[PDB]
């Protein structure tokens, strides 16, 4: 800070610190500097990844709170079945995609890593209703502690539709006491957006920081087959986008060159912070002005969908699992390579908007099929290279995560007519 | 439609609710669908037991809150301190009632729930003194994630009282800050009754799974415990008042036979009505026009034990709390029945009636003793058997929390020498 | 008669429960009486210690966000940056201070009241680096839940300096929102006051059960001990004085001798009147006549350095946290030295001025620098040792905390060049 770095434009700043990284990771870490790297810059990027996970159980929580409390509550089913159903949709697609590239380049198949034979050949357990049910919090407090946003998703909305029927009633006592405690979240959402906007200052070190060690380490396992896993994601990612939203908004009547015109904002701010409710901050402020929707629309859709948006998670997965697999050179066919609806679409609903997600979400997946030594089988290995590219991985996952999240928004607001057109024209 | 649905006086289709599940456990078991009831219907219940413990520990924060600094003694009197020991031990006595038959009728030893050979090594509990200092909570945001509900209590009262003795100070920011504190409690309380609302709207089915469940897995015995568990809260009550409300009566000088023969309006309204302040108005008339009391007194006794002296559902959840533990196999101790006296009187405080009580302070009690209502566990079904059966009990436990009110309002009128004796003379 | 017990000024009352407790725990110790004061004794002291161990999340939480949004870059001008900055700093070098002369005097290393070599066995514990990234928290609710004090310091702050900065917005519903919450914060931080005063007004019981269990299960110096304690922080006190304040004072042109010479009447006042805001008239006399610093510094420093600047806190703090990590046989290691110097300085932005805030205080950095504070434990005897003594530390504290505001003061007026030099220069 000297008073000019909090002023050059966030998003060009974030832009220059990732550039600058991956160069210093390219260069220190051909130079054998792994060590300097990982002993003195690693720790600010693991500062600026524990502030990205510090504001996101409050934000959810209060940002839920707030966009039910101020949309009425038939309006709010009808938004949040369409970005349900448009969740499903679009997340189902991306499973296929990931099914699709996680073979169209073979990935993971020449790294003869020592083993014929394991033990994912099959494992469904897809427990669907147990799933359903884990949604509604058994003690919503302890919902918070834990960190699990569904439950505290659910039990948010419900608070919300609770205070709004409040301030209908006649009570003049419990018209104000439902008033306070609306403008109590309502001052802890802003408050939120503030420390979200003042860590994006901290940012541009922190991808500095994060990138260059990725670099440094990994910068030399992107010659082997592993590159053909980071191909397998950005080909598959940029599938998902150029097939299923351009698909969805053409439907629809949105144009979708117009739309990727006037999300850069959004999809950039994501696709380096690799974080959705980072970033939730630069969404609404690019589905307020750029997009035109009305605020009693983003002012929900957009928090709700940055957790629960399983595109990027579940493309993720149907490519990193289908690697492990073949790693570890024990087979598994399509339908026995559905462990992703298993925990993508459904143990991992919530956890879809924090940093390295997908790494924790696939160590969820490989240890419930039956994979569960550590520390040396080819199991360990398969998937310590994962979490090695974890984050050009992640750069990607969430990037698609908040474009579906403002296509979704924008399709909602488009079916409900609250989308102004007056920004839709050039 | 579905209006039908709701307009329906609910707490009575939740005996239709319970009564069809007999009938449908029945003729499933006999027709052998054990395994389709159990795949298929459970899961309504499942969910509905969940949605009933999601409320129990905001509710008891919040209403907790909002009754301390009702009646703390920051803003009690000479009347009110007497008035509010008198609510209390009142309670406490018709707890100990309850435990003295249910252990006096061997409430739930005719039901077969409870697995074969479940645990030997229940025994072997803490000290008295112990379990006593285990009231006060080490933390009490970390007593709100664990779910214990006993601390929780303890801290709410506390922060109530202190609360009310800073409404009293001088400095207006002060005054404010308490005051906008207890609004925000006030407002989550009456957010956490209209949820309580919707989850009793629902309760019908949640019951209607639970009975078929319990039901058709083994064909248990549903009509004997039942018909015992009303009848020993029957008999619970006529003893109540018939030995405290009448030595209370004798000890001060009040002839409690005259007292009844006077009180039988209020009675009779309130045993038909079902309503602890429904029926507010004509009790406060009967203190008024026969027991003599001047508005003085029976302006803020009675409007405050409509609210905090449910005696009735003192020894309601006092004999349902050894129902639950009988019919589980798990029989209670002193360290436990006393647990369930301070539980079952503390949280006689935050009460609302209907939607305040709801059968919820029972689904408190049993978290207060440790007793979990995990879905799927016993205590589930010995929980939903009983507010199933709960219109039976309840139309019958509404009138002795208003003979309750009327002896308290009586007391004080006569140990402050106001009562006027002209209307108790032959 | 109870009103007696409570007017004694709350100090004095504990100590003489310390000196009562030492007497009677000797003659039960020879009478052989240890097991009557282990089993009706010292359940007082265990009360008191988990009624103590309740306030300080609480308080840590909503006397960090309203003692932050009191002093952030929003509402501060450039005096009132680097009067903070001031303060800070010479809390900083307080606490190390404090931790130098405990280590020097080698505080407690003769009570051996621990349970032995062990006891808390950790194998690897976090590296300074380490240390320094768990200050943020990856989910504030659950550093909440939890008990870490560090991570609820850290996010407190942020939210306060977040509120306030919403307070200077435009919008007026944002606005509001942020004063709704940041009097809510407030209410709950005097509510806390309350309930530690209240607590405070129990202490000498919980002090005498303590200190009657140690001194009769086993005779351990306590006289001695303490006395090197009390020897110890008048060193601290006076090493404090006559370094941080000497130095300032001179590598900025202020002669320290006659600042000393000037300032008497405040040193004296503090001292007799054992209080920080009730010496705050006299302290601003004394700025104003015999310094020479004009309104506009010393109506904005003083009456918030008698607020957040305590070096003679920060002081105890550091020689008492030394005492008790001396005492139960665990010297405390480096890493923890700097969670001490950081989690003292932080909670003096926090401080209460209710008579024994410098307990509370110090129970909250014992339990945020790792030595748990749960009852029975050893450090619960350590920490009553030391709130005994209390009493003879207090008349010196609010000496250095008063002379470090005058200090502030006239450092800050010189560098603003609006100090009257009429009054130094002879």
């Given at each position: 800070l000297l008073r000019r770095y909090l002023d050059y434009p966030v998003l060009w700043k974030i832009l220059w610190g990732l550039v600058l990284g991956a160069v210093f990771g390219l260069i220190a870490g051909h130079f054998g500097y792994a060590g300097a790297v990982k002993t003195?810059?690693?720790?600010?990027?693991?500062?600026?990844?524990?502030?990205?996970?510090?504001?996101?159980?409050?934000?959810?929580?209060?940002?839920?709170?707030?966009?039910?409390?101020?949309i009425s509550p038939a309006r709010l089913g009808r938004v949040g079945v369409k970005i349900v159903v448009y969740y499903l949709a679009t997340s189902a697609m991306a499973v296929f995609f990931g099914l699709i590239v996680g073979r169209l380049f073979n990935v993971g198949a020449n790294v003869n890593l020592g083993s014929g034979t394991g033990k994912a050949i099959e494992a469904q357990p897809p427990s669907l209703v147990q799933t359903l049910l884990n949604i509604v919090p058994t003690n919503p407090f302890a919902s918070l502690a834990k960190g699990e946003v569904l439950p505290v998703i659910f039990f948010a909305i419900i608070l919300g539709i609770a205070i709004t029927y409040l301030m209908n009633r006649n009570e003049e006592r419990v018209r104000k006491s439902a008033e306070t405690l609306l403008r109590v979240f309502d001052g802890l959402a802003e408050a939120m957006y503030l420390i979200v906007g003042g860590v994006m200052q901290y940012a541009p070190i922190g991808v500095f920081a994060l990138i260059a060690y990725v670099m440094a380490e990994q910068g030399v396992?992107?010659?082997?087959?592993?590159?053909?896993?980071?191909?397998?994601?950005?080909?598959?990612?940029?599938?998902?986008?150029?097939?299923?939203?351009?698909?969805?908004?053409?439907?629809?009547?949105?144009?979708?060159?117009?739309?990727?015109?006037?999300?850069?904002?959004?999809?950039?701010?994501?696709?380096?912070?690799?974080?959705?409710?980072?970033?939730?901050?630069?969404?609404?402020?690019?589905?307020?002005?750029?997009?035109?929707?009305?605020?009693?629309?983003?002012?929900?859709?957009?928090?709700?969908?940055?957790?629960?948006?399983?595109?990027?998670?579940?493309?993720?997965?149907?490519?990193?699992?289908?690697?492990?697999?073949?790693?570890?050179?024990?087979?598994?066919?399509?339908?026995?390579?559905?462990?992703?609806?298993?925990?993508?679409?459904?143990?991992?609903?919530?956890?879809?908007?924090?940093?390295?997600?997908?790494?924790?979400?696939?160590?969820?997946?490989?240890?419930?099929?039956?994979?569960?030594?550590?520390?040396?089988?080819?199991?360990?290995?398969?998937?310590?290279?994962?979490?090695?590219?974890?984050?050009?991985?992640?750069?990607?996952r969430t990037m698609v995560n908040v474009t579906g999240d403002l296509a979704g928004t924008v399709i909602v607001a488009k079916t409900e007519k609250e989308l102004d057109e007056s920004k839709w024209i050039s």
């Open positions: 003195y810059i690693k720790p600010f990027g693991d500062l600026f990844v524990r502030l990205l996970k510090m504001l996101v159980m409050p934000i959810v929580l209060a940002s839920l709170v707030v966009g039910a409390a101020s396992r992107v010659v082997g087959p592993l590159a053909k896993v980071v191909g397998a994601v950005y080909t598959g990612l940029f599938l998902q986008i150029v097939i299923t939203y351009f698909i969805l908004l053409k439907v629809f009547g949105i144009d979708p060159i117009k739309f990727i015109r006037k999300a850069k904002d959004a999809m950039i701010t994501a696709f380096v912070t690799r974080s959705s409710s980072g970033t939730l901050p630069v969404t609404m402020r690019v589905a307020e002005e750029e997009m035109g929707v009305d605020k009693g629309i983003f002012s929900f859709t957009l928090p709700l969908g940055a957790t629960i948006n399983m595109d990027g998670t579940a493309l993720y997965q149907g490519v990193t699992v289908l690697f492990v697999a073949n790693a570890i050179g024990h087979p598994l066919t399509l339908g026995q390579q559905l462990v992703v609806v298993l925990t993508a679409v459904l143990a991992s609903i919530g956890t879809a908007g924090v940093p390295g997600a997908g790494a924790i979400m696939l160590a969820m997946v490989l240890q419930s099929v039956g994979l569960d030594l550590t520390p040396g089988s080819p199991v360990a290995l398969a998937y310590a290279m994962i979490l090695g590219i974890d984050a050009i991985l992640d750069m990607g």
